[PDB]
From Swiss-Prot:
It comes from Severe acute respiratory syndrome coronavirus 2 (2019-nCoV). Responsible for the cleavages located at the N-terminus of the replicase polyprotein. Participates together with nsp4 in the assembly of virally-induced cytoplasmic double-membrane vesicles necessary for viral replication. Antagonizes innate immune induction of type I interferon by blocking the phosphorylation, dimerization and subsequent nuclear translocation of host IRF3. Also prevents host NF-kappa-B signaling. In addition, PL-PRO possesses a deubiquitinating/deISGylating activity and processes both 'Lys-48'- and 'Lys-63'-linked polyubiquitin chains from cellular substrates. Inhibited in vitro by GRL-0617. May form homohexamers. Interacts with N protein. The chain holds residues 1027 to 1190 of 7096 of the full protein. The gene is rep. It catalyses: Thiol-dependent hydrolysis of ester, thioester, amide, peptide and isopeptide bonds formed by the C-terminal Gly of ubiquitin (a 76-residue protein attached to proteins as an intracellular targeting signal). It is a multi-pass membrane protein. It comes from the Viruses. Residues 1-164 form the Macro domain. This is Papain-like protease nsp3.
Length: 164
């Protein structure tokens, strides 16, 4: 049910939208979370997704961490999407602000290829320190499944589209 997306490639689409409001409107099979290895959903996409689930995402995440330990940088896990989606694919992109290797961003995007269609943010951008133009390039060059990108900042959306 995605609408108002601009087509970038055969499988990559983009919209200036809040991923939480997109998830509520569409109820996608998969919503991607921009997670950290601990699944501590404090801010950004994670804090926003968590708050929309009334903290049910954090409770579920803490139980997952208690059982399995932390995720790898570039890794992922599939948990419930609660009221936003059937599933939430928690993906850990490298945090450039913590000295994490930017090459792990390709590995993080590879997790998207296990799902036919996903609603997602740009990985490693925002508070994770990577260049969003670089993140979009890696997305297009790595993801083969149908990905619908929600870009929150209008000025960033315009820059991403005009430079692609
Ligand atoms: C920690 O990794 C991050 C990854 C991406 C991000 C940024 C990248 C970005 N910056 N301007 N639009 N996009 N995205 C969001 O914060 C974002 N995107 C879509 N819908 C949203 N609703 C609430 C937040 C939000 C930050 C952090």
């Amino acid at each position: 049910s995605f609408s108002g997306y601009l087509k970038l490639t055969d499988n990559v689409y983009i919209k200036n939208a809040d991923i939480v409001e997109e998830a509520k409107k569409v109820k996608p099979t998969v919503v991607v979370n921009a997670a950290n290895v601990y699944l501590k959903h404090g801010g950004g996409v994670a804090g926003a997704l968590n708050k929309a689930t009334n903290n049910a995402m954090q409770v579920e995440s803490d139980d997952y961490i208690a059982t399995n330990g932390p995720l790898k940088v570039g890794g992922s896990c599939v948990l419930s999407g609660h009221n936003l989606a059937k599933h939430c694919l928690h993906v850990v992109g490298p945090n450039v602000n913590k000295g994490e290797d930017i090459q792990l961003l390709k590995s993080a995007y590879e997790n998207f290829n296990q799902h036919e269609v996903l609603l997602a943010p740009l990985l490693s951008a925002g508070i994770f320190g990577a260049d969003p133009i670089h993140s979009l390039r890696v997305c297009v060059d790595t993801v083969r499944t149908n990905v619908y990108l929600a870009v929150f900042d209008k000025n960033l959306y315009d820059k991403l589209v005009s430079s692609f």
